[PDB]
């Protein structure tokens, strides 16, 4: 409120910073996932071995 | 997974996940993570004659 | 319009307006706009700012 259209490029930019990081915190915790999933299948595998 | 290292030794693996200050989410203590952090690509520019 | 730049920046274009002397229409407090204020008129001369 009365932000003065001065600093709001700068929170415009602190926005999409942090926009950024949770999209790369998403994409890891999905690949994080994805390994789960992939050793899971290993390790049934090798008990059925 | 559990392996059994062949030099007659066992051990657990694990997978790790890094909560550092780029993906915590609402810090509880410092408030120093996500937020609070700026890393902005540039600053308020103005093009002047 | 929206314009993210290629280095991972985004900002805000806007496009300007100029009030400057001849487009106020009754200046609120200095009484100097197009209107309201005294024209030179002579043959062989020009005002500049």
Do not use: C, H, P
């Not at chain 2, 700026?38 to 520019?45: E, F, K, L």
Request: negative net charge; proline residues 0%.
């Amino acid at each position: 409120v009365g932000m003065g259209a001065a600093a709001l490029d700068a929170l415009i930019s602190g926005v999409d910073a942090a926009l950024t990081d949770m999209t790369s915190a998403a994409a890891s915790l999905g690949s994080i996932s994805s390994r789960i999933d992939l050793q899971s299948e290993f390790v049934n595998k090798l008990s059925d071995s | 997974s559990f392996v059994r290292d062949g030099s007659g030794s066992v051990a657990v693996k694990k997978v790790d996940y890094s909560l550092n200050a780029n993906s915590v989410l609402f810090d509880t203590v410092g408030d120093t993570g996500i937020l609070d952090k700026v890393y902005n690509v540039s600053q308020a520019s103005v093009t002047l004659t």
